[PDB]
Design a protein around this ligand. Sequence first.
Ligand SMILES: [Mg+2]
Length: 183
Amino acid sequence: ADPKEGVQYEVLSTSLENDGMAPVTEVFALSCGHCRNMENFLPVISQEAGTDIGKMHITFNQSAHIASMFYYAAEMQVDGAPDHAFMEDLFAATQMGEGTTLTEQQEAYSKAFTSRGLVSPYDFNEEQRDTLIKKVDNAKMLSEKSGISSVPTFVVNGKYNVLIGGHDDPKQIADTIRYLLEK
Ligand SMILES: [Mg+2]
């Protein structure tokens, strides 16, 4: 019944213990349908693990740096990470798919901000741009340092990565998180 190394979690080869991530961090990508659908189970996992869950946006290619820019632009204007409804708008914009232009995508991104009274990144001022660059660059560092390939996933105290393939449901993910926190 104890979670086991190599099955329901692994020890990251390069620890991020001291790099300031939330004790429980969901590593995700706005382009990933799986991460989009996982949003729906985050309330249950957060409740059974008994802690809030932070977010880190990973990047696997250049195209993804645009997604990461929109995400950190959202994150920096709200308390904590963007809520599940703001997250849905950003997922939806990123995954518009093949018959959509880069322009239609950009207007969906932009709407997510303005419709909640926030500033769209194109309209940022000098100060905001400076804050955004620092956030994206930190994400980029932490991503590359972690070596993570597979999202969504959950990192606990910057040192263990939960293997979601090793769990049958969200309760079991939450239980592994708790076990790792309870070391
Ligand atoms: Mg915030």
